[PDB]
Design an enzyme around this catalytic site. Structure first.
Site, PDB file in Angstrom:
ATOM      1  N   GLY A 186       0.815  -1.201   0.000  1.00 27.11           N
ATOM      2  CA  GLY A 186       0.000   0.000   0.000  1.00 27.11           C
ATOM      3  C   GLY A 186       0.853   1.257   0.000  1.00 27.11           C
ATOM      4  O   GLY A 186       0.422   2.320  -0.453  1.00 27.11           O
ATOM      5  N   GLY A 189       5.418   3.046  -4.169  1.00 26.96           N
ATOM      6  CA  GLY A 189       5.393   4.301  -4.896  1.00 26.96           C
ATOM      7  C   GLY A 189       5.653   5.448  -3.950  1.00 26.96           C
ATOM      8  O   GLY A 189       6.030   6.532  -4.387  1.00 26.96           O
TER       9      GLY A 189
HETATM   10  C1  709 Z   1       3.391 -10.248  -0.178  1.00 29.75           C
HETATM   11  C2  709 Z   1       2.918  -9.196   0.918  1.00 29.75           C
HETATM   12  C3  709 Z   1       1.489  -9.080   1.206  1.00 29.75           C
HETATM   13  O1  709 Z   1       0.550  -9.862   0.545  1.00 29.75           O
HETATM   14  C4  709 Z   1       1.026  -8.132   2.192  1.00 29.75           C
HETATM   15  C5  709 Z   1       1.922  -7.293   2.912  1.00 29.75           C
HETATM   16  C6  709 Z   1       3.348  -7.371   2.667  1.00 29.75           C
HETATM   17  C7  709 Z   1       3.885  -8.327   1.667  1.00 29.75           C
HETATM   18  C8  709 Z   1       5.415  -8.420   1.382  1.00 29.75           C
HETATM   19  O2  709 Z   1       6.020  -9.448   1.715  1.00 29.75           O
HETATM   20  N1  709 Z   1       6.137  -7.424   0.764  1.00 29.75           N
HETATM   21  C9  709 Z   1       5.611  -6.288  -0.006  1.00 29.75           C
HETATM   22  C10 709 Z   1       4.632  -6.363  -1.041  1.00 29.75           C
HETATM   23  C11 709 Z   1       4.147  -5.162  -1.786  1.00 29.75           C
HETATM   24  C12 709 Z   1       4.639  -3.909  -1.512  1.00 29.75           C
HETATM   25  C13 709 Z   1       5.650  -3.723  -0.467  1.00 29.75           C
HETATM   26  C14 709 Z   1       6.208  -2.415  -0.140  1.00 29.75           C
HETATM   27  C15 709 Z   1       7.149  -2.295   0.853  1.00 29.75           C
HETATM   28  C16 709 Z   1       7.653  -3.446   1.630  1.00 29.75           C
HETATM   29  C17 709 Z   1       8.660  -3.244   2.707  1.00 29.75           C
HETATM   30  N2  709 Z   1       8.774  -4.094   3.671  1.00 29.75           N
HETATM   31  N3  709 Z   1       9.493  -2.109   2.728  1.00 29.75           N
HETATM   32  C18 709 Z   1       7.166  -4.720   1.362  1.00 29.75           C
HETATM   33  C19 709 Z   1       6.157  -4.948   0.311  1.00 29.75           C
END
Ligand code: 709
Length: 238
Positions: A186, A189
Site C-alpha cells: 500500500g 510508490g
Molecule cells: C506479499 C505481501 C502481502 O501480501 C502483504 C503485505 C506485505 C507483503 C510483502 O512481503 N512485501 C511487499 C509487497 C508489496 C509492496 C511492499 C512495499 C514495501 C515493503 C517493505 N517491507 N518495505 C514490502 C512490500
C-alpha cells in the site's frame, strides 16, 4: 507503514495518493510530486493497468476520508515505466505519471527536490517513509497518512539480509536491525524523504521487502539519485 504514527496535515506536501477507479475506486499506491505535471512513483504499481484513464491522483490529502465522489483530482495523461523494468526485486522500479493538468503549488501541495549526484556521498540521518499502506502483515489501507523515521543501511549490509537477491547500487535500503518500523503493502510508490541541510530530498521510492518490519529485513527502495538523468530525459517536452 508499520510502527509509525499519524502525520500532521501538510507535513509531507509532496505525498499523493494514487487511486484506481476499477472495479470501484480505491487507493492503489503512493507517489511524490516532483514537477507541476509530474508524479514520481513505482513501476510495479501499474500491474494490470491497461490505461491511464482509470487513474486519479489526489494531492494535499491527510485522510482517505477526505476523498469522495465530489473531491477534485488530477487525471493521468501518460504512464511512463522505465524500459528496463521487469519487477520490483530486479530493480528499475520507477515510473513517471504525466498529469492531464498542472498542480498549483501551496502549503498543502508542493514538489520535493530530487537528490543531487554530488550528494551520493552525503549521509542522510533524518529519513522518513510515509503512506497509507498496511500497518501489519494482514492489514488494509489506512485512513490517516502514516510516517516512520527509519535509518538507512549500507548496501553491503542490505545484501547480507537478502542473500537470494542482488541488491544493486540502484537500490537503497532502510530499516532497524530488530525491525519494528518499515513500509508495507500500500505504501508502494511512496517517497523515502530525508531532510538534509534543512531541505527535504526524495532519496528513495518504496519498492519491496520480505514481509514488513521483520528483524534483519530492511525495506528496499529505488535509489532515486541513480535516475536523475532518466527523469530529466523523460520529463522534457516532445
Ligand atoms: C506479499 C505481501 C502481502 O501480501 C502483504 C503485505 C506485505 C507483503 C510483502 O512481503 N512485501 C511487499 C509487497 C508489496 C509492496 C511492499 C512495499 C514495501 C515493503 C517493505 N517491507 N518495505 C514490502 C512490500
Amino acid at each position: 507503514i508499520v510502527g509509525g504514527t499519524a502525520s500532521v496535515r501538510g507535513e509531507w506536501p509532496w505525498q499523493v495518493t494514487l487511486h484506481t477507479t476499477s472495479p470501484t475506486q480505491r487507493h492503489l499506491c503512493g507517489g511524490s510530486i516532483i514537477g507541476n505535471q509530474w508524479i514520481l512513483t513505482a513501476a510495479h504499481c501499474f500491474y494490470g493497468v491497461e490505461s491511464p484513464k482509470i487513474l486519479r491522483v489526489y494531492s494535499g490529502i491527510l485522510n482517505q476520508a477526505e476523498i469522495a465522489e465530489d473531491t477534485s483530482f488530477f487525471g493521468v495523461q501518460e504512464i511512463i515505466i522505465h524500459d528496463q523494468y521487469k519487477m520490483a526485486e530486479s530493480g528499475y522500479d520507477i515510473a513517471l505519471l504525466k498529469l492531464e493538468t498542472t498542480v498549483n503549488y501551496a502549503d498543502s501541495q508542493r514538489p520535493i527536490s530530487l537528490p543531487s549526484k554530488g550528494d551520493r556521498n552525503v549521509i542522510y540521518t533524518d529519513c522518513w517513509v510515509t503512506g497509507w499502506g498496511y500497518r501489519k502483515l494482514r492489514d488494509k489501507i489506512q485512513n490517516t497518512l502514516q510516517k516512520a523515521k527509519i535509518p538507512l543501511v549500507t548496501n553491503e549490509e542490505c545484501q547480507k539480509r537478502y542473500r537470494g537477491h542482488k541488491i544493486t547500487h540502484k537500490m537503497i535500503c532502510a530499516g532497524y536491525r530488530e525491525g519494528g518500523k518499515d513500509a508495507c503493502k500500500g505504501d508502494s510508490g511512496g517517497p523515502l524523504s530525508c531532510k538534509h541541510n534543512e531541505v527535504w530530498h526524495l532519496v528513495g521510492i518504496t519498492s519491496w521487502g520480505e514481509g514488513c518490519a521483520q528483524r534483519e529485513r530492511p525495506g528496499v527502495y529505488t535509489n532515486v539519485v541513480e535516475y536523475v538523468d532518466w527523469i530529466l530525459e523523460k520529463t522534457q517536452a516532445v
